[PDB]
Amino acid sequence: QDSLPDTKASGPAHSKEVPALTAVETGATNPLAPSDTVQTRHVVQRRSRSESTI
Amino acid sequence: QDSLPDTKASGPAHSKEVPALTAVETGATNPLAPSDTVQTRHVVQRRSRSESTIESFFARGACVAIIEVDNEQPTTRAQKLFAMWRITYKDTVQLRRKLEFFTYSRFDMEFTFVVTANFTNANNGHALNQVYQIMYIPPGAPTPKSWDDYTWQTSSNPSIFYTYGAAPARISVPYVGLANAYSHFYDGFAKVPLKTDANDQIGDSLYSAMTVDDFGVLAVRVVNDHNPTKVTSKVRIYMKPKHVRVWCPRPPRAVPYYGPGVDYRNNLDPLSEKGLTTY
Amino acid sequence: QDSLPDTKASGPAHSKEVPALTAVETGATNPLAPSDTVQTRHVVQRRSRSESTIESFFARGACVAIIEVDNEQPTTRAQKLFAMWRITYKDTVQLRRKLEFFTYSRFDMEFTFVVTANFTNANNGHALNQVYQIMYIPPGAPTPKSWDDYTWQTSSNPSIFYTYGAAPARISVPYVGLANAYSHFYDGFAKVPLKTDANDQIGDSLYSAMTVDDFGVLAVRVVNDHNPTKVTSKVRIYMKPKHVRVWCPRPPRAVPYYGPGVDYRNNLDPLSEKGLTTY
Amino acid sequence: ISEV
Amino acid sequence: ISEV
Amino acid sequence: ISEV
Amino acid sequence: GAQVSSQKVGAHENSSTINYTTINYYKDSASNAASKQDYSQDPSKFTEPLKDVLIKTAPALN
Amino acid sequence: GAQVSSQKVGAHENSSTINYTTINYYKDSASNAASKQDYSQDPSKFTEPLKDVLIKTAPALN
Amino acid sequence: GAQVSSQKVGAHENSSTINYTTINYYKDSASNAASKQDYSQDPSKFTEPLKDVLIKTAPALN
Amino acid sequence: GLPVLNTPGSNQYLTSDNHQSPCAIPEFDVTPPIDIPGEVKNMMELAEIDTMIPLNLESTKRNTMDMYRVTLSDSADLSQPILCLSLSPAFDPRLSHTMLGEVLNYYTHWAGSLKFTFLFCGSMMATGKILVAYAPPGAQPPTSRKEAMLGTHVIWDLGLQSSCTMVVPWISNVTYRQTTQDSFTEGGYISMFYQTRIVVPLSTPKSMSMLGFVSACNDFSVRLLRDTTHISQSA
Amino acid sequence: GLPVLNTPGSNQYLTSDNHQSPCAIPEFDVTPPIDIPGEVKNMMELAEIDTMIPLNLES
Amino acid sequence: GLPVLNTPGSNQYLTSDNHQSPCAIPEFDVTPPIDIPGEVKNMMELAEIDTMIPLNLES
Amino acid sequence: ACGYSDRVLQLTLGNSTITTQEAANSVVAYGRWPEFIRDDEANPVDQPTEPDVATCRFYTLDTVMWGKESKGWWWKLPDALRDMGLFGQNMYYHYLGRSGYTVHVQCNASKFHQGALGVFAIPEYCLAGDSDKQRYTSYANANPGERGGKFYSQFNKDNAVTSPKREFCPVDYLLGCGVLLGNAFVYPHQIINLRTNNSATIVLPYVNALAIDSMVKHNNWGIAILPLSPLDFAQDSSVEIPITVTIAPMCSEFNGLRNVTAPKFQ
Ligand SMILES: CCOC(=O)c1ccc(OCCC2CCN(c3ccc(C)nn3)CC2)cc1
Ligand SMILES: CCOC(=O)c1ccc(OCCC2CCN(c3ccc(C)nn3)CC2)cc1
Ligand SMILES: *C(=O)CCCCCCCCCCCCC
Ligand SMILES: *C(=O)CCCCCCCCCCCCC
Ligand SMILES: *C(=O)CCCCCCCCCCCCC
């Protein structure tokens, strides 16, 4: 099996966790996903990156 | 075992069961058999529907294109030193009609290329054997302007190098659709005109058409440098669907095709004259 | 083991058993052997009838047709740019006579195609290698009017694409009969004249003939566009029955064939003159 | 192998 | 295989 | 043989 | 990795189950020939799309 | 799915049962070569179609 | 020495794991075709080369 | 180098073949199937679905909506046939273009039982009894109810059950008939007559339409795929 | 690509040969055999049946 | 000599194919791999790395 | 038991109820009842909107009159419903929307009237056009909304090259699409035969090559109503009865919310 990560059913938010905020100065890229900034449904992912292998 | 249902020995009737009567208004077809309306014997059936499977029905290489390409001295005007063909089953009518018995289809595609060539002019000496280059250019990739320009370097596009006289070229292509099935018919548009638009051309589109370049093109050229004498050639493309699945049945085309959509123009009179009480 | 019955050491006789006497009126053949009419030794027989099996007897590719086809400039008159041949074993006499040793037959058929070509005219330059298209047109399917018309698109008809110089083309065909066996002879008609008929042509038919198109035709063309100089070609068709079964034995044809039925015309004198008491 |  |  |  | 199956014998030679062998040479399944052992199904979704599917001997409209 | 059988050896080299191997490549049995191991039968249906088949040593007509 | 593996079937014919067979004919491995069963890895060395890699929900700079 | 010997047929291209070949786009990530409604596995499924027969192809009636409408009336000549038709499912004009006839024109041979269902589209106050028949081939095609009576037949009585099905039973000499016309493999005759007559009351239309439908029974099969005469193309 | 070497006889057509070849009509539903009377398995069966000799071939 | 039959596609060259072929330099002593930092296994790794957008393409 | 029938139905959806005392059973198109997009067939990742009873209810379209000259009527879905209460709003405020439907077609008359309506539900109902021009029918003319369209008895070509009508020309016996009407029965259908039934009830699943699509760019189903047998009554040559189409969305779900789409129907 080589499919990509499934999408999670994510809900409403009121917290002190702020993933939408970051600091690119550090050299890193924010590891975010739709479920961090918007309400998502559960999608079972079948797509794979087989053609883009080296 | 794949044979059809045996016939039952059925006898005389005097009952309140009336299978001969029905009501087609309901939308259904009466599931009747000879044994419901007549006395039948017992027949052991050996006949099977093996040739009419969706696979067997399409399992044949159909001609969908003739690409004409020449090899001659590159002069300074419109010539055919290379050719391009938008991949499609619609330039031809025969396979088009079979696939159109259905709304949706999903299959792998086999392409077989029959190359033929000949001498144009009575005589300027002859030609050594020609090698042909068929390059698939997927939408987005650079289209050749010249028969020997850089796009033919083909670093990532699939290319076939065919040698004249050899067994016809053959390749397979996976199910490459942007959707879960190829749509043989699309009751829609690719763009919608909005009230807020500046001109009314912005949101204008061809009815029933989806993507502009849909699957891309096949570019053909003779890799050989020109001989003194000219050689004209034809790449015949045969298409065969394999590992086939089909959905939602449609009536067969009854009048001659008029372009890519369902449009008709003429010969709208498909049926013959025959008398009501004539056999 | 498939050898024939051994010979028995048989001795002198003085008995009331008279095997030498019989009565052919009964319809039967006397099942005699040397040991019934003469003193024999014991011979262990190794000989076998392996070459005379129904399969071995037919197991050979026989020429049943020569289809002549040209590739030349399409002019405006009767030409051979494409040809058609009603499939049959009856255009030739040799295989026809072997299959006719029997009334009924059931087999699979192998077809091998020997293509040969040549230059017609002393010299108009030359020709690049020709590719041939053999299309089977089953009864009902559209017959070509033109060498490059739409029927050659061949979406559902079986077609062979042969390249000159390559090993002869070959294909197999299943038992395709409308009945449980191919009839080599049909003592009947396809239509019957009824008293109530308007003209007496309505119910008229060819004696011993069954279906009009019986198995269909093979259409042949050169897929190549015409060279300046003309190339004439011949497709020789070899037929071989395999997985063969035969019924009801018939006497061999003793006089020259006169058409598809059993009709004779001339050379009705098959036997030589030889004296009654001459060795 | 795989025999059906 | 199948040996006769 | 070697079956993965 | 050889695949073995029974041919459906039509015209039988005077000699019973006869088999044929198949092997895939390519990684991409699109490259494969057609197996042609195709199963069938009911006409029903098309010949009787009814919510109350009724028995052929009883009145169609009751 | 390979088929193996004994050849009927005619001229024996100075070296016993020798075999040959056969494999069918095609699904359609019509595509197959000829097995040529053909069994035989009696002439009887043709040489003696009689309702009372009699013994060769007894009078044909009794 | 035959190598057997599962194809990833895309468009399924109306007939399940389908396999393909591979055999190397040459001693030098450079002569071999490409296996194309390629494993992947994390973007991390590139997307987060950090000495203290932090959790996406906590402040990037604390 | 394995010693091999090339046989006849080597390097030909047969349209009908079944072989492997190199994949032009290696490792392509194929879009998965979704469960779409309406899937077909065999073309005979479509020939089993009832479709309207163009039963009336008279001069002004053909290639118009009236070709599907057979007129019945309380004053029709009772001696005469309502309709007559030949059992040639792919060739006879009335049948050739139905879904049944249309699949059969892609095949050289057919076999099996057929069925004809007739719809009375008259007003509810209209009554009637009709004889519909099938005569297996070989005799005079029926010109009178008296002759039609003698063969396979259904006596339809018009009432709450609007429609009547006549099964044409597979009765044939050959194991498969042909899809084109041919006396050797001919199927016979279909004909219809009033058994009594259409009776209406007053203030009721005295004339109405009958619709006819055809489909194949489950014993029906077809063979030898071929190209149809029902579609073509000009240069 | 399996390394092969073509031998003599490659690409000839011998009338007497026994080989497989592609089926031109795939999946054709073949009509079954019925038990017909009079079947022959070997041509010598016919030569074993008595037939009338043209013993007198005078002018 | 094994009886074989050549199919369509025989002797073509497809840019996209995957086949074996003779090694031009037999038994060459190949230099071993060393563990180099920065290895990539899939091109989508690079598209996942943040890069600066030319957001202002005015004249 | 009690006295139930194939001809007496009650359809209840949301705050709407339909009763019929003379139906002909009911068709479930291709044997599939409408359903929601499953997680393993899902494609847009954003949480969908499911308005349930506020959008999945019976909208009655403007009535058409069947008369002796009537050649046929046609509607497209979702187009017919683009302005139907909260359904239309959900349809235009979201990029993506799927829907199943219950189609209920109404035509009553009397034991003395006569005629037969062919009610057809067609997947991807592509119609033919006006002109010499191929695939030239404009979005505005392709989509009549509630008003629907009509069939014609013959192909009268839109002749004026200068200012083209860019309309459809649907010829009845060619189903307006190049095939013959007698074969339209391979599609999900019912017949309103006036001596048998007042109505037809076809239930429709979402049919498409995608799990979900743009409802504004694309119609999934087409409703074609062609008189198989003409309207006739007593001897009055200008008879006329109403045909009323009532449609309900089913299992409607929406994805990709943003500002409202305002199409130009001018
Ligand atoms: C929307 C209607 O059209 C179709 O359904 C339909 C039409 C054409 C189809 O073919 C697949 C598209 C292409 C994709 C790749 N392709 C190739 C690829 C490589 C080579 C050498 N030659 N051809 C050629 C065909 C598949 C489906
Ligand atoms: C009634 C007397 O004739 C026969 O018995 C008899 C005569 C001919 C026979 O051949 C079988 C019929 C056809 C069927 C198909 N066919 C084909 C099919 C495909 C191709 C490429 N080429 N030929 C050619 C032969 C079989 C039997
Ligand atoms: C399973 O297939 C194991 C048995 C293999 C037998 C030998 C096959 C020889 C041909 C190998 C084909 C390799 C194709 C890439
Ligand atoms: C039974 O046949 C299993 C053994 C197979 C041995 C390898 C055969 C290699 C050739 C396979 C032929 C495939 C033909 C379509
Ligand atoms: C492992 O491979 C053992 C099984 C071999 C089966 C027969 C293969 C026939 C082809 C051999 C190829 C030799 C190549 C140099």
mmCIF file of N, CA and C in Angstrom, chain H:
data_model
loop_
_atom_site.group_PDB
_atom_site.id
_atom_site.type_symbol
_atom_site.label_atom_id
_atom_site.label_comp_id
_atom_site.label_asym_id
_atom_site.label_seq_id
_atom_site.Cartn_x
_atom_site.Cartn_y
_atom_site.Cartn_z
ATOM 1 N N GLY H 1 1.194 -25.445 -16.492
ATOM 2 C CA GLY H 1 0.212 -26.073 -17.355
ATOM 3 C C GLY H 1 0.750 -26.836 -18.555
ATOM 4 N N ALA H 2 2.012 -27.239 -18.488
ATOM 5 C CA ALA H 2 2.666 -28.004 -19.561
ATOM 6 C C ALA H 2 2.254 -29.458 -19.736
ATOM 7 N N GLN H 3 1.970 -29.831 -20.969
ATOM 8 C CA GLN H 3 1.559 -31.186 -21.352
ATOM 9 C C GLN H 3 2.721 -32.040 -21.857
ATOM 10 N N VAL H 4 2.981 -33.202 -21.258
ATOM 11 C CA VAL H 4 4.122 -34.047 -21.645
ATOM 12 C C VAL H 4 3.724 -35.448 -22.072
ATOM 13 N N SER H 5 4.204 -35.864 -23.228
ATOM 14 C CA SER H 5 3.918 -37.200 -23.753
ATOM 15 C C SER H 5 5.010 -37.902 -24.560
ATOM 16 N N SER H 6 4.909 -39.220 -24.640
ATOM 17 C CA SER H 6 5.844 -40.036 -25.396
ATOM 18 C C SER H 6 5.776 -39.993 -26.915
ATOM 19 N N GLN H 7 6.891 -39.695 -27.552
ATOM 20 C CA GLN H 7 6.976 -39.806 -28.997
ATOM 21 C C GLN H 7 6.979 -41.271 -29.437
ATOM 22 N N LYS H 8 6.409 -41.661 -30.574
ATOM 23 C CA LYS H 8 6.579 -43.051 -31.034
ATOM 24 C C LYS H 8 7.880 -43.164 -31.848
ATOM 25 N N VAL H 9 9.003 -43.478 -31.210
ATOM 26 C CA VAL H 9 10.271 -43.485 -31.926
ATOM 27 C C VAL H 9 10.432 -44.497 -33.061
ATOM 28 N N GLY H 10 10.643 -43.943 -34.260
ATOM 29 C CA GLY H 10 10.926 -44.747 -35.454
ATOM 30 C C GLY H 10 12.397 -45.138 -35.589
ATOM 31 N N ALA H 11 13.219 -44.354 -36.278
ATOM 32 C CA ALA H 11 14.670 -44.616 -36.331
ATOM 33 C C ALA H 11 15.428 -44.134 -35.090
ATOM 34 N N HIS H 12 15.845 -45.122 -34.307
ATOM 35 C CA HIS H 12 16.568 -44.924 -33.052
ATOM 36 C C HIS H 12 18.081 -44.707 -33.210
ATOM 37 N N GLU H 13 18.525 -43.541 -32.806
ATOM 38 C CA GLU H 13 19.942 -43.247 -32.709
ATOM 39 C C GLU H 13 20.700 -44.178 -31.779
ATOM 40 N N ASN H 14 21.980 -44.483 -32.017
ATOM 41 C CA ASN H 14 22.759 -45.305 -31.094
ATOM 42 C C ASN H 14 23.128 -44.743 -29.728
ATOM 43 N N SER H 15 22.118 -44.445 -28.923
ATOM 44 C CA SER H 15 22.322 -43.897 -27.596
ATOM 45 C C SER H 15 22.070 -44.807 -26.401
ATOM 46 N N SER H 16 13.940 -47.401 -25.271
ATOM 47 C CA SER H 16 13.941 -46.192 -24.436
ATOM 48 C C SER H 16 12.936 -45.117 -24.819
ATOM 49 N N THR H 17 12.131 -44.651 -23.851
ATOM 50 C CA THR H 17 11.088 -43.649 -24.134
ATOM 51 C C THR H 17 11.487 -42.172 -24.199
ATOM 52 N N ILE H 18 11.284 -41.570 -25.365
ATOM 53 C CA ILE H 18 11.593 -40.148 -25.572
ATOM 54 C C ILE H 18 10.321 -39.278 -25.557
ATOM 55 N N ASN H 19 10.304 -38.204 -24.790
ATOM 56 C CA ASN H 19 9.120 -37.364 -24.680
ATOM 57 C C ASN H 19 9.140 -36.014 -25.399
ATOM 58 N N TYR H 20 7.962 -35.436 -25.632
ATOM 59 C CA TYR H 20 7.854 -34.070 -26.116
ATOM 60 C C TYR H 20 6.873 -33.235 -25.302
ATOM 61 N N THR H 21 7.165 -31.953 -25.201
ATOM 62 C CA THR H 21 6.348 -31.049 -24.406
ATOM 63 C C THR H 21 5.499 -30.106 -25.260
ATOM 64 N N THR H 22 4.264 -29.873 -24.818
ATOM 65 C CA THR H 22 3.313 -28.988 -25.472
ATOM 66 C C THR H 22 2.700 -28.000 -24.493
ATOM 67 N N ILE H 23 2.593 -26.700 -24.824
ATOM 68 C CA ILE H 23 1.895 -25.711 -24.001
ATOM 69 C C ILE H 23 0.964 -24.852 -24.847
ATOM 70 N N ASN H 24 -0.322 -24.755 -24.491
ATOM 71 C CA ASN H 24 -1.251 -23.854 -25.168
ATOM 72 C C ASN H 24 -1.160 -22.403 -24.719
ATOM 73 N N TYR H 25 -0.939 -21.523 -25.662
ATOM 74 C CA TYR H 25 -0.757 -20.084 -25.434
ATOM 75 C C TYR H 25 -2.002 -19.231 -25.529
ATOM 76 N N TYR H 26 -3.024 -19.836 -26.112
ATOM 77 C CA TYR H 26 -4.286 -19.166 -26.381
ATOM 78 C C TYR H 26 -5.504 -19.737 -25.678
ATOM 79 N N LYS H 27 -6.385 -18.828 -25.269
ATOM 80 C CA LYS H 27 -7.650 -19.175 -24.647
ATOM 81 C C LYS H 27 -8.604 -19.941 -25.556
ATOM 82 N N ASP H 28 -8.814 -19.510 -26.783
ATOM 83 C CA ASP H 28 -9.683 -20.223 -27.714
ATOM 84 C C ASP H 28 -9.117 -21.536 -28.239
ATOM 85 N N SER H 29 -9.696 -22.691 -27.866
ATOM 86 C CA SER H 29 -9.239 -24.015 -28.338
ATOM 87 C C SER H 29 -9.067 -24.190 -29.846
ATOM 88 N N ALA H 30 -9.802 -23.448 -30.660
ATOM 89 C CA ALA H 30 -9.603 -23.448 -32.109
ATOM 90 C C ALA H 30 -8.171 -23.071 -32.528
ATOM 91 N N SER H 31 -7.550 -22.217 -31.712
ATOM 92 C CA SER H 31 -6.168 -21.784 -31.877
ATOM 93 C C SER H 31 -5.126 -22.850 -31.665
ATOM 94 N N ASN H 32 -5.538 -23.961 -31.054
ATOM 95 C CA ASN H 32 -4.609 -25.047 -30.758
ATOM 96 C C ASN H 32 -4.133 -25.873 -31.952
ATOM 97 N N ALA H 33 -2.906 -26.348 -31.829
ATOM 98 C CA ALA H 33 -2.414 -27.325 -32.786
ATOM 99 C C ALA H 33 -3.187 -28.668 -32.715
ATOM 100 N N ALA H 34 -2.937 -29.617 -33.581
ATOM 101 C CA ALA H 34 -3.597 -30.901 -33.510
ATOM 102 C C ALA H 34 -2.906 -31.900 -32.624
ATOM 103 N N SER H 35 -3.528 -32.395 -31.565
ATOM 104 C CA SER H 35 -2.940 -33.445 -30.732
ATOM 105 C C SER H 35 -2.474 -34.730 -31.425
ATOM 106 N N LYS H 36 -3.099 -35.134 -32.545
ATOM 107 C CA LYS H 36 -2.774 -36.342 -33.308
ATOM 108 C C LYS H 36 -2.615 -37.707 -32.639
ATOM 109 N N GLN H 37 -3.135 -37.820 -31.415
ATOM 110 C CA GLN H 37 -3.196 -39.089 -30.698
ATOM 111 C C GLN H 37 -4.607 -39.613 -30.873
ATOM 112 N N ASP H 38 -4.865 -40.128 -32.057
ATOM 113 C CA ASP H 38 -6.239 -40.489 -32.375
ATOM 114 C C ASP H 38 -6.606 -41.946 -32.286
ATOM 115 N N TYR H 39 -7.654 -42.130 -31.482
ATOM 116 C CA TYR H 39 -8.167 -43.485 -31.262
ATOM 117 C C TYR H 39 -8.977 -44.000 -32.463
ATOM 118 N N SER H 40 -9.103 -45.301 -32.594
ATOM 119 C CA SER H 40 -9.854 -45.854 -33.717
ATOM 120 C C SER H 40 -11.158 -46.520 -33.346
ATOM 121 N N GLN H 41 -11.801 -47.175 -34.300
ATOM 122 C CA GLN H 41 -13.059 -47.877 -34.030
ATOM 123 C C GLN H 41 -13.266 -49.045 -34.984
ATOM 124 N N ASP H 42 -14.333 -49.779 -34.770
ATOM 125 C CA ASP H 42 -14.731 -50.892 -35.620
ATOM 126 C C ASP H 42 -15.238 -50.455 -36.987
ATOM 127 N N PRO H 43 -14.897 -51.156 -38.078
ATOM 128 C CA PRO H 43 -15.618 -51.075 -39.363
ATOM 129 C C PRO H 43 -17.094 -51.487 -39.316
ATOM 130 N N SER H 44 -17.460 -52.381 -38.414
ATOM 131 C CA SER H 44 -18.807 -52.901 -38.184
ATOM 132 C C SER H 44 -20.078 -52.147 -38.575
ATOM 133 N N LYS H 45 -20.259 -50.887 -38.149
ATOM 134 C CA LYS H 45 -21.435 -50.124 -38.560
ATOM 135 C C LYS H 45 -21.580 -50.042 -40.069
ATOM 136 N N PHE H 46 -20.437 -50.057 -40.752
ATOM 137 C CA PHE H 46 -20.354 -50.078 -42.206
ATOM 138 C C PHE H 46 -20.176 -51.471 -42.816
ATOM 139 N N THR H 47 -19.294 -52.306 -42.283
ATOM 140 C CA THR H 47 -19.048 -53.647 -42.831
ATOM 141 C C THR H 47 -20.037 -54.725 -42.467
ATOM 142 N N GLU H 48 -20.837 -54.471 -41.447
ATOM 143 C CA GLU H 48 -21.878 -55.407 -41.022
ATOM 144 C C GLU H 48 -23.065 -54.714 -40.376
ATOM 145 N N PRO H 49 -23.839 -53.879 -41.065
ATOM 146 C CA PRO H 49 -24.993 -53.203 -40.468
ATOM 147 C C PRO H 49 -26.138 -54.177 -40.158
ATOM 148 N N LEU H 50 -25.943 -55.449 -39.862
ATOM 149 C CA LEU H 50 -27.016 -56.424 -39.712
ATOM 150 C C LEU H 50 -27.721 -56.476 -38.373
ATOM 151 N N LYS H 51 -29.025 -56.724 -38.429
ATOM 152 C CA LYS H 51 -29.817 -56.894 -37.220
ATOM 153 C C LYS H 51 -29.447 -58.206 -36.509
ATOM 154 N N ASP H 52 -29.255 -59.290 -37.247
ATOM 155 C CA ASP H 52 -28.717 -60.500 -36.677
ATOM 156 C C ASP H 52 -27.303 -60.671 -37.204
ATOM 157 N N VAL H 53 -26.278 -60.148 -36.521
ATOM 158 C CA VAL H 53 -24.897 -60.334 -36.986
ATOM 159 C C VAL H 53 -24.420 -61.754 -36.694
ATOM 160 N N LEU H 54 -24.082 -62.420 -37.777
ATOM 161 C CA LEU H 54 -23.691 -63.817 -37.717
ATOM 162 C C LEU H 54 -22.211 -64.198 -37.683
ATOM 163 N N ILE H 55 -21.875 -65.376 -37.167
ATOM 164 C CA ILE H 55 -20.468 -65.764 -37.097
ATOM 165 C C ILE H 55 -19.862 -66.211 -38.425
ATOM 166 N N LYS H 56 -18.712 -65.678 -38.870
ATOM 167 C CA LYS H 56 -18.122 -66.036 -40.178
ATOM 168 C C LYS H 56 -18.032 -67.536 -40.586
ATOM 169 N N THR H 57 -18.020 -68.472 -39.638
ATOM 170 C CA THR H 57 -17.978 -69.887 -39.970
ATOM 171 C C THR H 57 -19.321 -70.543 -40.204
ATOM 172 N N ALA H 58 -20.422 -69.930 -39.767
ATOM 173 C CA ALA H 58 -21.779 -70.488 -39.955
ATOM 174 C C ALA H 58 -22.431 -70.061 -41.286
ATOM 175 N N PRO H 59 -23.401 -70.765 -41.903
ATOM 176 C CA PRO H 59 -23.974 -70.377 -43.195
ATOM 177 C C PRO H 59 -24.560 -68.967 -43.175
ATOM 178 N N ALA H 60 -24.226 -68.077 -44.102
ATOM 179 C CA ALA H 60 -24.740 -66.703 -44.119
ATOM 180 C C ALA H 60 -26.273 -66.601 -44.158
ATOM 181 N N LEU H 61 -26.802 -67.466 -44.993
ATOM 182 C CA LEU H 61 -28.223 -67.635 -45.068
ATOM 183 C C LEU H 61 -28.558 -69.019 -44.585
ATOM 184 N N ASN H 62 -29.304 -68.975 -43.498
ATOM 185 C CA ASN H 62 -29.827 -70.181 -42.899
ATOM 186 C C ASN H 62 -31.352 -70.184 -43.062
#
